[model samples]
Target chain A: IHTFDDIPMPKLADPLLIYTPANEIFDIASCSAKDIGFAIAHAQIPPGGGPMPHIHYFINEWFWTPEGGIELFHSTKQYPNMDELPVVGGAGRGDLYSIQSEPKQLIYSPNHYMHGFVNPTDKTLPIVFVWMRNEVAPDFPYHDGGMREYFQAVGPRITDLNNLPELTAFASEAPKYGINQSSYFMEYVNTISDKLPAQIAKLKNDKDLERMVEVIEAFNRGDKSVTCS
Target chain B: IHTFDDIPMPKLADPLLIYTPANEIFDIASCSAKDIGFAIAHAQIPPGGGPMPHIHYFINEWFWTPEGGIELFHSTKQYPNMDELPVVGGAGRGDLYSIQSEPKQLIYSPNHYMHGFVNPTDKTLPIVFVWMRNEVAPDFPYHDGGMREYFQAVGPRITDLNNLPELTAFASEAPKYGINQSSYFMEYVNTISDKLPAQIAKLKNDKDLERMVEVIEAFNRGDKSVTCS
Candidate 1:
């Protein structure tokens, strides 16, 4: 009792992509890359082109903006002067945002600190981001000898006010929507930590990086979304 | 700022081989069917070559032997006179067996029914079933019309045995071992009702199917298994 073309399809080329330097598609249709290890892409950021300061060492991104708004940057030290640190953070619309692949979330690039993305909004809004990486291995953890040459010489002069004086007193009460260029967000943290040792050696054979490190350690111990159970 | 060979990967192909049987062969390695709709296979039967009494009109299967052991057959009515039905169920190492692509958990074949599978030890066992279907464009309404002519007229004969008198009083206390063919307990009720229709469609999409219809309507209004979840 089988039929629907004898049930057996799934084989377009793997799908699940959303990378964005500009045109990196993969939202489902026809899907490819073999059948998919992980892919998601949805964009609309006009107000200011969105996400800029970058760093994802080995990929573990998730952002949801039911409507508009975007501005996240973290850099506890090593050349992070968002006026003066103490950033921690929040925002809404079922708001949730996370970035980790090892101390790489919104340019504060711990293991290579610095980050970017700012859309505060004025017109073209709508943000529903999701970028979980690790297709078949690679989760990033490279800072080699001498902290990888001091993150390639102070990771391209990190900006947003190096050593952030509390992000300049929280951008002096919203400096026209905060965050000013720190060398274009330290060139997106020296272009994703200059390919962190070949993306941590392709995350050593990824099973979705052990299912996204059991979903980012169950959302860093909070435990809720990202399910497989 | 992508690298690791320009990030792409995403490859998965295997969707549990749609309840296999297309003249048998179904091979898959490591596993991947991109976002997986369904397909999984890691077989070996040959002690006497099992699997024949087909019925996957849509899909739902699950068998985890890990090493050696297999024998299953189920019957609600048709030709069910295995000295009077009931063989409770069989599972080894970590146990888990199911079947329920429809109302047919143990009885209620809906359209077609009659299963098969056997390799009761003696080498060549290695089974690891997991074929779960129904995802072809949200179209799976039980795969269209007259359920294949009601499984070709009372599906593969096995006429009545008085509604399986509690499967022969739960197979006389279950725990037996071998040689009881009726296509080997209808291939253990078609491989544990093919792992209960995707866990009852993920317990009716997480609503937990009203706690499994209030624990099977409180054991058909009788009660047991410590009723009340």
Candidate 2:
């Protein structure tokens, strides 16, 4: 029997955002939603943008690709020196594995596994999705590291969505979040690898890209028929 | 010390979606993210669309408006018969309250209080946002009622986002989810209310809407400047 005056509106809004050198944005970073159980994020990764190959021995990452596709590069294998590994074409280098994520796909990268991703499309179509870093209990190894503070300490906090920050290092803070660095072999998958050219060429079947091109074309022609329904 | 062969890729992709008559789409409904704790949703509510006034005596409803504005109609009080309540222009009816949510804003509607929302735009612009139905512990009163099953049983399970299903009722199953209907006063706030026109008029200040129109206009005119950054 609470009166209208007796009920107070709960004050919770404006999630924390983490910006990277390539404008890869992580909105609603870890620890922001910890009170409600999962550490969630609405990520906007630029075309050909993603993190370096890294491993988390404490948490499992769950992904949901709603707006666009993503290409995941992961493996149970980890090379101490990535530069020494031999390169393969679309498959990947050394023991690393590559997988093309479908539109509206879901992927899980578990703890103790090495993983990373890249937006396969060459177009400005960024990979948009919501993901979760599940399990935040202090009992986990290196429980001191929460991604919110990890990225905050490592990456720049660019307020404008249009700007990209300068490149840097995660040297001292890596182990705090159970973040283990993988080799340059996985890092090259985002650019230097021979596999990416072929992967980006596969965008012809992308329904979202096709729709985006149509919308852009219609907008240019001032076509009255070109409008959102 | 887990080897690559020892780790298995997690099998979790493609979240469940719910669709309403007016093309209101709820992608990632309740319980879909339950295993990770907290039920989440990426909602797309059509212009002038929303649900009737309802109360969730158990879970707190949290909202994050990223794409557009939302007009909330809520109150601590609940009248037995909504039609009997007196109407107030631009403010709300009787003891019922009205709030205009802003872009990138966060709002928390606690349990025990009645609430509902509407897309306050006159154009084809739909209100897009991510929300959470938090606190899923079984001890919270009606433990049997989960929104995933509630909407599935009451609303249409639309596979195609384009086509909306026929209207229906939640009559017998309402109480199971702790959903209590409020007076029509709040329901009318979505439409047939004097406050909405003014609320919708405030969209001129919406940066997201401004950007959307610019992007749409640029694409229509074939302007290179309209390209995504």
Candidate 3:
């Protein structure tokens, strides 16, 4: 019974979950109900803001570059990396860099897997993506652990102190940060704060410093050996 | 590439010739510079008006019923029957009546084959269809004959002559003619006249009066044999 005239655009402020440590801004245009039930969102990351290592228990997400590029981090660890605090490595350096000239690809995060992003440069990186989920309820099983506290405690302290040679080289080669980078970061922070209640519950018994040290070690090694997952 | 936004409704007078006897009204929405074009058309046939027996020399058409129904005709004869003037037999009563209930189906007409339709009722049946072609300029090829003149000569003469059981049954049992039947017929006449020049060029030299006789006999017998292809 669906006609061409029956299709509608996505509603505003639908409360889609936002990950922390990553200052991302999301503007959802449509969801699976309006379309295929997948969430189509526009995300922006500030030059110095991005998500920390985290994993979704169920949501399957996909990303497409719209305005800028994104540094994609894939979890190479065997077990869930929830304990190791994830870092951006650098503002624009990561395992993968996506640009407008490249074919849009899906950044898949399987269940219980850890992945994150970083704005390597002082530029605003925006991504448009669609996320599909089998469940419709608001029961997003996400564990932020002590990463949030750690980032707050040690983020400014560890600046460039343990930067790996590879990380430095990659950061230098990354695109220059753009003017909108700060806005991207602000949006990301706001998004993470909006989901603070859920994130806090995931880290009820976790220690902040322990997670911070582990994440720092991984950043120094330029390897995922220290990832919590 | 032509997007949905680029398609415009075709003018009522400039419809794509589907060659189905069923009365059709098409509003072209869009077209490309390729052999195959995309369009949105509304096709309808009132109880009797339909395309004559003809075939598209270079196009394949597909239809979706967004409004009413379509009675598709398939020819029983291999080629133009020189002896019997191949009359459509079994499955001749619009083999596929694509009503408003079914999904769109692809009705393919290979080059040099005959197909047509008849509304069979007084109801105004309508259909939405899209056509593709292998050639840039598509032509409707009708068997060369004096069919038009024959119809003109015999059409009004055979009034009240209901000898054929089929035609009698059709007139008696068929659904009531739609309120718009007159307008539908008017359109059909206009369509046939517009295509007459091309059709006449193809049927000018045929000596087989058999086809003409078969149709005339069908008309005399009161069978529903006349159709728009």
Candidate 4:
């Protein structure tokens, strides 16, 4: 029974413990806009605060920053396998296309396209307006209702913004939450592959590859999902 | 043929002359997202730069401010006539409900709802993320294709971001561009009504009243358009 009167407004000072380091408030919680297939958030990332690079298997994410200090590294191509991804932080900066000092603009990252951003500043806290729309398909895994649910699953709930609880690294448990490994994710895997790689490797299982193509085709139809070209 | 490749990335520093005083750039031009029924922009309203309040006859506008400093005045009820509206700036701020110092949130201004915002600051330039989606109904009046088109029609173009051109007051000729007068709009008309009143009065013409109801009903259905209830 959510009505215009029920629209939630969360302040920046009080962010939930969704993405640690970077603070986020699901202003338009997924439940409110569940019928519409999208949710919005007012998020700010402090210096050095950002999620590890990863791609959503069933979401289209968009970002707009008013005071740009974020450095975004994204992929324009698809990589079904982590080994096929560009070596993270390689000489040519891997296969990621980077945009720095980008301010006051909308950036759309379609599902399956690897992406991540960091507030590459020592003093400036970049403000990002995030909108995530899930694939309209009836039942997508790790959906957990919407982005809010996925985030809640992977992170700790904060009764106190000042004392954020420890969060499991997103890369370590993303597969359980429906997130796939991007180049940066693979890069992270390299760091702790001895114990974590086997689990991370399961993200690219054959079922995921086939499902990935199905989602891409559905998105390509350009009706339920959006693409630039 | 607009693809993800054609998605726009307009900077805040370089704003076009859309809503004078407040700088704007049609980052996601209407043409770019025309197929999807929406457009987006990164906009900033300097001190005292907000446009007069007004209602769109066929457009639903939504806004999010990451570092909120904008003072938004909106209405929970609908008014189809100018005379029936609350007195301009009367006690209790008329029928308008004002939200000030609202930070890190999403504000949805459904079509035909009276709404407007101002920076309300002496130094802080509030960054507002603007997303305007036209009524899904095909061929609405003064549609001009989309919000960007309506904006371009109302304001002057900027070849040089540093030197913006002179622009007409949005309240003066909004009807020609598909915008209807709101409580705040009537306030502005009251100022120049001797000469502008008669013209602004035309915004409430019988045809518009009929169309407003049509839009509201469609929106309440909660598909294509959005409403809380």
**On residues A200-228, what C-alpha lDDT tens digit does candidate 4 reach at each position?**
11222223222333443444354444221
The candidates, ranked best first by lDDT, are: 2, 4, 3, 1
Query: Tens-digit lDDT track for model 2 on A1-229?
Result: 0001110111124446677655677764222221222244557776546765676655555445554355565554443432232232222433334555655555555565556666645343333322223454456442323655666776776565566566455544666666665332222222222233332223222332233334434434556553311
How far out, in Å, is residue A222 in model 2?
64
Each model's DockQ? 0.00, 0.01, 0.00, 0.01
Best-fitting candidate, scored by lDDT: 2
Estimated TM-score for each candidate: 0.17, 0.32, 0.23, 0.33
Any runs in candidate 2 off by more than 4 Å, and if so which? A1-229, B1-12, B31-36, B76-94, B124-145, B162-168, B183-229
In terms of lDDT, the poorest run of 10 residues in model 2 chain A is A1-10
i-RMS for every candidate = 29.4, 26.4, 34.1, 26.6
Query: A-chain TM-score per prediction?
Result: 0.22, 0.57, 0.39, 0.58
Docking quality of model 4: it rates as incorrect
**Candidate 1 lDDT, B135-228, residue by residue in tens:** 3325543222212222222212213323311110112212121112222222232112222333222322212222333443443455655221
DockQ of 2: 0.01
| Tens digit per residue, CA lDDT, model 1, A80-156 | 23343222111100111222222111111222233444453235544433334333223332211111122222213
Error of 4 at A218 (Å): 88
lDDT of 3 by residue, B1-229 (tens): 0001111233332333332222233223333322223233444545445543443333334434333234444332233221222211212211111111222333433433444444433366665444333442323221222122222221222222233111111111111210011111111111111111222122221122223334434433545434222
- Higher-ranked by TM-score: 1 or 4: 4
